[PDB]
DNA sequence: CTGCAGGGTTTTTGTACAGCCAGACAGTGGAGTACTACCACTGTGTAAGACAGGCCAGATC
DNA sequence: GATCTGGCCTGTCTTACACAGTGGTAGTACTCCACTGTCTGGCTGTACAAAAACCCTGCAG
DNA sequence: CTGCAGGGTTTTTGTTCCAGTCTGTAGCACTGTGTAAGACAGGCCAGATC
DNA sequence: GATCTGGCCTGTCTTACACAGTGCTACAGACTGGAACAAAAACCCTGCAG
C-alpha cells in the first residue's frame, strides 16, 4: 500500500529490529512465504460440469502470455510481452478473498448455512483500456517501453 | 587547517589559472613540458603554490620585461587565468585510477594487433582490436564492454 | 534513510496506529520541528577575533546564494538558481553532531575534561564537483560543492 | 548577631525474624532463520579544448 | 602571372559524463522447540537500630 | 401454573462549559506528464470541366 | 475520352487542460472537568390479571 521497495524494507526493519528489542515487523521471507497464499493459485477447487478445453491444473500461478507461441522466424514474429493468470484462478482467488463478507452477509440475512451451497450469482464486469506511451526512467536506446494495454475485471 | 583536495583535474587547472587541460603543461605541480616528460619521469620537485601562482600571473599582467607571447608563456610557466580558490597540491585518486585504467584500456586495444610492427594503423583496424578484446572479456572473466569505464570496471 | 515522502510516512504511521497501537512511530508535524537539531542555525556560538565580512547573527539557516544580486535586468541577468548555507553555521551544526565522539575519544584517551579546552584543531576536507546530464525538471547540469 | 554541639523530630536505611514464587542455568540436537551477500539486468557514444599538417586564399610585386 | 603567408580544417590526443536500484536466490553464521531439577533473590506481616540535615537551644564571643 | 404493564436498581451514554492541544487534511504553490479535442493538411474521388 | 476542382475525410500536430505528487500550514475538529441529567439494558419484582 505504501510503493516501499523490497530492499528499503528490509533496511527499516533491521533498524526497527536492532532498535527496541524486539521483532516488530517481521522480515521479508517470512512475509513472503505469508504473502504467497494471497496471490493466485494456492486454493483448491474444482467445476461441476469440467471445464471446456481447460487444463484442470489448479495450484499454477503466473503465466506468460505468449501461450506457447512458436518463436521460430519465419512465422509471424512472437516478441510480444505478456503476462496474465488463468482466468479462472483469480476469478476463484478474488471469490475466496471476498469470502469473509459473503459469510458477514449470510449472517445477516440470517439464512441457514446448510441452506447456502447453490443459488449463488457472482456478477463480473470486465474491462480492456490501453495505456499509450508511458514514459519510464534510462531508456536511451527503444526498448517498447510505451504502449501498453490492461485487461481488468471488479 | 583546511584542504582543497577533491576536485577533479578540470576543475583544478581551471581555477588555478591553467591551460585546461592537454596543453604544453601538463602537470599541477612540476612545470615541465610535455615532451621532457618522457624524457625524464621520475625525477621532479613539486614547487607550484597558491600565492606564487598569485606572483607569477602578476608578473604576466603587467610584464615587466616585455617579453613576447611564448617568451613570456615560458617566463611563467604557463600561467594564463588569475585564480581565485586556493588549491591543495596534491592529485585525485579516483581518477587516477581510471586514467591508468584507460591507458591500459587503450595499449591493450593495440598489442592485441601490431603496433611496433604496424607504424600506423588505420581506424577500422583500431575498432576491429577493440571488438575481439571485448569479445575475449566476455569470453573470460565475463566482461561486457561499457561505453566508458567507470571505477569498477577499471578494479 | 529510505526515501519516504511525507504522505508515505504518514499512511504508515496511521496505519501501524490503528493496529497493535500502541503509537509507535512518531507522526509527521512532530519530526517537522524536531529535526531543527541537526540542521544548521540552532547551535551557539562565536569567534575571537570576531569574523571578517560576516554578519555575525548564529541562527540563520538555508539561504539563497545570489546573496542579494541587483535584479536589474539592466544589468547582468540574475537568473541563475542557488541555494546555499552560511559555512560556518555548517561547520558548527556538523562539530556539535560530532560532540559525541570527539567528547568519547577525549575520554578515552584518558585526557583531562574540565581543562584542555583551548587547543582543539580540526583538519577538514572539502570537496566539490559538477554534475552532468542531469535530467532536468537553464540547461541540464548543476554543480554541487560539499565538505567532510 | 557570630560558630558549633548535646539534645530533639522526622525521615530514611538497614538489618533484622519468617516464607514464596519468579527467573535463570545446565542438558541436546538442529532446525530454522535472519542476514548478508550473491545473481540478473538496463546498454553499447558523447562533449570540450590543444596542436601540428596541410592547404588555400587573399594580398603582394 | 609567380610567390608568399596567416588563418582556417582535419585529424589528434586528453580531460570530463551518465549505470543504480530492485527484485529473486543461496549459503551460512547465529538462535529457540521440548524435556528437564535447582538455586538466588526480589517480594512480605512488624520491631530494631543507624544516618542526615534542619530547627531550636545553650553556652560561648 | 402462566402473560405483559411496568414499579424498583445500577449502569451507560449523553451531556452541558469552557479552555485548550494535537492532527489530519485540505488547502496552496508549483511545475512535470498524458492525454484527447480540435485545427488543418492533403490527397484524392466525385463532380464539373474541357 | 483526358483533365480541373470542391468536399471530404483520414491522418497529423498542438496544446490546453486535467492530473500528480510534495513540502508548509491553518484550521477545524477531535480530546480533557464538575453537575446533572434523562433515559433505556437487563435483572428482579409487584400487580392486575387468565
Ligand atoms: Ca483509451
Ligand atoms: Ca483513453
Ligand atoms: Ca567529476
Ligand atoms: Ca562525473
Ligand atoms: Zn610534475
Redesign the pocket.
Known amino acids: 500500500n505504501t510503493f516501499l521497495?523490497?530492499?528499503?524494507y528490509?533496511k527499516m526493519?533491521?533498524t526497527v529490529?536492532a532498535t527496541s528489542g524486539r521483532q516488530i515487523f517481521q522480515?521479508l521471507?517470512?512475509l513472503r512465504n505469508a504473502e504467497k497464499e494471497l496471490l493466485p493459485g494456492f486454493h483448491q477447487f474444482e467445476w461441476q460440469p469440467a471445464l471446456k478445453n481447460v487444463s484442470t491444473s489448479w495450484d499454477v500461478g503466473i503465466i506468460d502470455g505468449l501461450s506457447g507461441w512458436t518463436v521460430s522466424v519465419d512465422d509471424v514474429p512472437a516478441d510480444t510481452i505478456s503476462r496474465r493468470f488463468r482466468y479462472d484462478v483469480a476469478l476463484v482467488s478474488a471469490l475466496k478473498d471476498l469470502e469473509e463478507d459473503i459469510m458477514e452477509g449470510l449472517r445477516e440475512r440470517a439464512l441457514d448455512d446448510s441452506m447456502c451451497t447453490s443459488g449463488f450469482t457472482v456478477v463480473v464486469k470486465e474491462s480492456c483500456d490501453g495505456?499509450?506511451?508511458?514514459?519510464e526512467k534510462?531508456?536511451?536506446?527503444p526498448?517498447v517501453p510505451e504502449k501498453a494495454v490492461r485487461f481488468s475485471f471488479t | 587547517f583546511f584542504r582543497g583536495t577533491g576536485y577533479?583535474?578540470?576543475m583544478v587547472r581551471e581555477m588555478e589559472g591553467l591551460?585546461?587541460?592537454?596543453?604544453?603543461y601538463?602537470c599541477t605541480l612540476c612545470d615541465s613540458t610535455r615532451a621532457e616528460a618522457s624524457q625524464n619521469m621520475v625525477l621532479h620537485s613539486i614547487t607550484r603554490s597558491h600565492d606564487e601562482n598569485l606572483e607569477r600571473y602578476e608578473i604576466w599582467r603587467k610584464n615587466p620585461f616585455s617579453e613576447s607571447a611564448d617568451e613570456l608563456r615560458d617566463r611563467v610557466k604557463g600561467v594564463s587565468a588569475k585564480p581565485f580558490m586556493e588549491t591543495q597540491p596534491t592529485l585525485?585518486a579516483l581518477?587516477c585510477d581510471i586514467?591508468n585504467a584507460?591507458e591500459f584500456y587503450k595499449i591493450f586495444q593495440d598489442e592485441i594487433g601490431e603496433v611496433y610492427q604496424k607504424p600506423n594503423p588505420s581506424r577500422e583496424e583500431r575498432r576491429r582490436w577493440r571488438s575481439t578484446l571485448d569479445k575475449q572479456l566476455r569470453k573470460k572473466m565475463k566482461l561486457?564492454?561499457?561505453?566508458?569505464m567507470?571505477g569498477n570496471y577499471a578494479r
Open positions: 521497495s523490497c530492499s528499503q528490509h526493519y533491521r529490529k522480515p521471507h517470512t495505456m499509450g506511451d508511458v514514459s534510462h531508456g536511451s536506446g526498448a | 577533479d583535474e578540470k591551460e585546461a587541460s592537454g596543453s604544453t601538463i585525485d581518477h586514467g584507460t561486457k564492454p561499457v561505453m566508458r567507470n
